[PDB]
Design a protein around this nucleic acid. Structure first.
Lengths: 294, 147
DNA sequence: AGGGAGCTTCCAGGGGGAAACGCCTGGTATCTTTATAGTCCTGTCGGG
């Protein structure tokens, strides 16, 4: 079953019928981030209503807002976050009516995008690739050992769906992070050339070389592991075809192979785009420096 | 270094200075989801400007909207998504000026929350604990080996 | 030991005083509506 069981028209009809939307102005986003920071400093991962109100007061202070109606504004903000599926509220009779709050997977993902300083680490990728290689190798050995529907579900499907797929998604996010980093560097090089292009030549060459080395090192690492990961996916596919198959395992393996191809292809494409820019900046600098001679 | 290097007041000041905000109306959110779906069906994880415009046209049809200025409306929506950090645009001289688009980690996280049907699994938890147990065991053996 | 009356102590009853609760009025926040003005597009025509 395609992760997205619905076609574009069906999804559009479904979204339209459920009236989904998200509204996080700077203050609300700051409050969410403050809640995320406060939750990370705690031992129980739970926040009371009073603690959330204190956090809202700090945001309001930070925005230099009137102390009038702050308890009301905090309640409206808390209700808005719950209504927007950012917070889960637990109302227990045992807690004398005091509600307990926890951030939802959505509220966490959003807050982390802004607060977590995510930079591309080669070590991280090498580690992730190591875990997926071991998980795929175990799943391939389990598929080759053969077994019943319970064995194929517990030792092959579960590791592919609940472990390998997650790791591949994490790698794809790391690539999308790298993509944002490249666009940021292009803006910095243009600024350096507008301030003092003569002194900026060494700094621009450093930024171009550091980015190029990183992209290449990454691609080298993906290519080295990619062949072993594909071989293990093929071993699982061959073992599945030999044991009468399972349409669920075949589709899952096909999806993982498609993601792996996307992950490998992205690196080469990013290198070509960076090379085009690098050549252009070098040509520009040479034209600016060397061709005027007086 | 705490994952969140900044205290709450510092973060609030930083957020205020950078002016970060999210506004996701039904139509734009539907367009984002349509883009996310279209990207998942592709082999290269890349979308051209014409393909994004075709996707917007389908959303507009699904919302029963006027076919007038759809190309403009689509450009406004695409620029809004890029301006909101949901899409990364690549403009290469080699591509004769044709821009290539990819969804940002943010645009993906948001689209997946709505489209991905997420339900809890013990098998998954058992596998995750097994992997972490092996990774922690190797790290402990490496720490005990010294170096 | 039983029965009644006196002294002494504690509870019951009265009276005051203010707060709290309940209700209304207006203010403050929030949101919507309405209008205006922009911005861009589209269309037409004419000219090149």
């Amino acid at each position: 079953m395609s992760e997205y069981s619905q076609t574009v028209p069906e999804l559009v009809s479904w979204a339209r019928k459920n009236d989904f939307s998200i509204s996080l102005p700077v203050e609300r986003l700051a409050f969410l981030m403050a809640i995320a920071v406060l939750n990370s400093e705690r031992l129980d991962g739970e926040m009371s209503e009073g603690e959330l109100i204190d956090a809202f007061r700090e945001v309001c202070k930070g925005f230099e807002q009137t102390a009038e109606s702050v308890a009301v504004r905090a309640n409206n903000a808390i209700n808005d976050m719950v209504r927007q599926k950012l917070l889960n509220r637990f109302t227990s009779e045992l807690a004398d009516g005091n509600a307990i709050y926890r951030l939802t997977p959505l509220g966490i993902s959003i807050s982390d995008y802004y607060i977590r300083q995510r930079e591309f680490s080669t070590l991280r990728l090498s580690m992730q690739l190591s875990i997926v290689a071991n998980e795929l190798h175990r799943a391939a050995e389990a598929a080759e050992e053969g077994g019943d529907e319970f064995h194929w579900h517990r030792n092959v499907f579960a590791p592919l769906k609940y472990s390998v797929a997650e790791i591949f998604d994490s790698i794809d996010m790391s690539q999308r992070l790298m993509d944002e980093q490249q666009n940021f560097v292009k803006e910095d090089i243009a600024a350096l050339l507008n301030q003092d292009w003569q002194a900026a030549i060494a700094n621009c060459e450093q930024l171009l070389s550091e980015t190029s080395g990183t992209l290449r090192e990454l691609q080298d690492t993906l290519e080295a592991a990619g062949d072993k990961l594909q071989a293990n996916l093929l071993r699982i596919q061959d073992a599945n075809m030999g044991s009468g198959g399972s349409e669920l395992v075949d589709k899952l393996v096909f999806d993982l192979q498609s993601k792996l191809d996307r992950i490998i292809s992205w690196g080469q494409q990013a290198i070509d785009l960076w090379i085009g820019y690098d050549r252009h900046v070098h040509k520009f600098i040479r034209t600016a420096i060397d061709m005027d001679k007086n």
